[PDB]
Amino acid sequence: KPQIPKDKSKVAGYIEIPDADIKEPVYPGPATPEQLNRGVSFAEENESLDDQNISIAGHTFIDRPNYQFTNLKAAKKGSMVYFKVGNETRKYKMTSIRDVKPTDVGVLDEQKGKDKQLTLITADDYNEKTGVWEKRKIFVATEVK
Amino acid sequence: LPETG
């Protein structure tokens, strides 16, 4: 089964969202500033490609409109999302849970039902004291299967 | 949880 590298400097996959012109290599988590400096990365260090919900975080940087997840808001309901691993191209469609604040604006959409999903997180303003990206917006995509 | 980054 698809495995995420132990070496944090090695690419684990590729994520693409055509409608938003996003094409990025995905690195192992957790998503710290160093990891996001490398590219978008898995949310948690213990993430698994066999999980029902796979989370990937990406930066928002206005100096570079098409950098990582800066242009993710351009991906509306129904937008195709491609997650490429070594042996498969997984396809997902953006749901109505998009561009929403992590808490109270939106929550568990399919984390338990309706199948496999990808949770894309735009991250900004990392707080070293708490280990949290204070500025976050989530986008949930469900597998086309 | 939804998650964080």
Domain ranges of chain A: 1-145
Q: Which residue's structure tokens are 């199948």?
A: A115
Our measurement of the distance from residue A7's CA atom to the centroid of its chain's CA atoms, rounded to an integer in Å, reads 19
| Nearest Cα residue in chain B from A125 | B5
* For chain B, counts of helices (H) and of strands (E): 0, 0
Kind and range of the H or E run holding A33 = helix A33-38
In angstroms, rounded to a whole number, what is the distance separating the alpha carbons of residues A134 and B5?
A: 10
Closest Cα in chain A, distance from residue B4 (Å): 7
DSSP category for residue A113:
S
In B, which residues are within 8 Å of A108 by CB distance?
Answer: 2
Resolution in A: 1.8
Q: Are A77 and A85 in contact (CB under 8 A)?
A: no
* Exp. method: X-ray
Asked if A115 contacts A145 with a C-beta cutoff of 8 angstroms, the reply is yes
Q: What is the radius of gyration, based on Cα positions, of chain B?
A: 5
Domain A1-145: give its CATH superfamily.
Answer: Sortase (2.40.260.10)
Q: Which helix (H) or strand (E) holds A13?
A: strand A13-17
